Write a protein that binds this ligand. Structure first.
Ligand SMILES: Nc1ncnc2c1ncn2[C@@H]1O[C@H](COP(=O)(O)OP(=O)(O)OP(=O)(O)O)[C@@H](O)[C@H]1O
Ligand SMILES: O=C(OCC1CCN(CCNS(=O)(=O)c2ccccc2)CC1)c1c[nH]c2ccccc12
Length: 327
């Protein structure tokens, strides 16, 4: 069977905390009043939730209302507990209220309003300095949630809200977030296809906070090389092939050997043989200004098959790539 794995940082944060911190099913929801809010317009509808721009009539302030679909309403206590535990933390979205929808029974989460929408809208037009600046801001949020014993598990450009005018950033959508418990086997059906770590693609369930660091590495490669997404898989199997064409097959097989990971037999005839490519191969005249030896060294230390070898959020913050950022 597979060889066990544990996080190399914040390993036992939840073992010491009182049961109330991580036992989300025991949490008692003190519901608010739905009538205090007026919906203005639908911002979007996904497979699990619906988001609206709204106004709190009790104080004239602008809010964001997220209504849960009945199918995704099962783990609402988990998302509430995580949001309350992280409230006030650096670059973390603030939960202001929890109400029930008027027509349907389903819970609705109320948040602070954040200007300029999606990270994806701006992340392909940033200067070198701005990529460095915003990467440091995301790292503050990830080190904070990891230090609090929580994995985000859905890091991607659509989940980062940036107010470019005020040089402000917020990490949103904590619907897939989970408490890290050493030795626990988690569900591998998390994160968006292009941002899934190799541990999810090979069905290795004993993963940790380092999953978020692979997703962050995917975001960095897309920004500095102007290629969105960087790893463009057709499905979950082709996603691993796309990765293998860059990182090579030798390091992939060394990874499955280290943790005694059983590979799906459908990978035998699609993986092939590939050597580790130099990051300089993705450099061209149109993206050369966004690339530096520091950027390539940093990217190389994030995008590693072995989840235990990747830089942690705190080590990433120490990298020379961030020396030019004003602190
Ligand atoms: N707290 C917030 N403040 C301001 N805008 C928000 C907030 N939360 C979500 N939005 C906006 O609401 C819109 C609807 O988001 P929606 O959840 O439908 O997309 P998504 O789920 O992020 O995309 P994906 O399906 O890739 O996850 C988004 O464009 C997003 O920018
Ligand atoms: O005007 C209001 O609600 C109008 C609508 C009442 C009906 N609901 C539909 C909920 N049905 S649902 O099946 O839960 C659903 C469907 C799609 C996506 C997510 C969830 C949409 C909003 C509200 C006024 N204050 C609120 C506070 C929370 C939620 C809604 C409101």
């Amino acid at each position: 069977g597979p060889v066990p794995s544990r996080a190399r940082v914040y390993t036992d944060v939840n073992t010491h905390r009182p049961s109330e911190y991580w036992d989300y099913e025991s949490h008692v929801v003190e519901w608010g009043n739905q009538d205090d809010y007026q919906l203005v317009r639908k911002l979007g509808r996904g497979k699990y939730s619906e988001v609206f721009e709204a106004i709190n009539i009790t104080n004239n302030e602008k809010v964001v209302v997220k209504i849960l679909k009945p199918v995704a309403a099962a783990k609402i206590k988990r998302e509430i507990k995580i949001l309350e535990n992280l409230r006030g933390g650096p670059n973390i979205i603030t939960l202001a209220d929890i109400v029930k929808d008027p027509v349907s029974r389903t819970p609705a989460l109320v948040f602070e309003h954040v200007n300029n929408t999606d990270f994806k809208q701006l992340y392909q037009t940033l200067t070198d300095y701005d990529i460095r600046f915003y990467m440091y801001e995301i790292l503050k949020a990830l080190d904070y949630c990891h230090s609090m014993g929580i994995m985000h598990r859905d890091v991607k450009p659509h989940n980062v809200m940036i107010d470019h005018e005020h040089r402000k950033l917020r990490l949103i959508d904590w619907g897939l977030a989970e408490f890290y418990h050493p030795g626990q086997e988690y569900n591998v059906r998390v994160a968006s296809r292009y941002f899934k770590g190799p541990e999810l693609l090979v069905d290795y369930q004993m993963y940790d906070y380092s999953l978020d660091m692979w997703s962050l590495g995917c975001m960095l490669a897309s920004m500095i090389f102007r290629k969105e997404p960087f790893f463009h898989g057709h499905d979950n199997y082709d996603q691993l092939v796309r990765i293998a064409k860059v990182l090579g097959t030798e390091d992939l097989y060394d990874y499955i050997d280290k943790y005694n990971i059983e590979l799906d037999p459908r990978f035998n005839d699609i993986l092939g043989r590939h050597s580790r490519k130099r990051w300089e191969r993705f450099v061209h005249s149109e993206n050369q200004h966004l690339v530096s030896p520091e950027a390539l060294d940093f990217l190389d230390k994030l995008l590693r098959y072995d989840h235990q070898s990747r830089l942690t959020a705190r080590e990433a913050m120490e990298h020379p790539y961030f020396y030019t950022v004003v602190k």
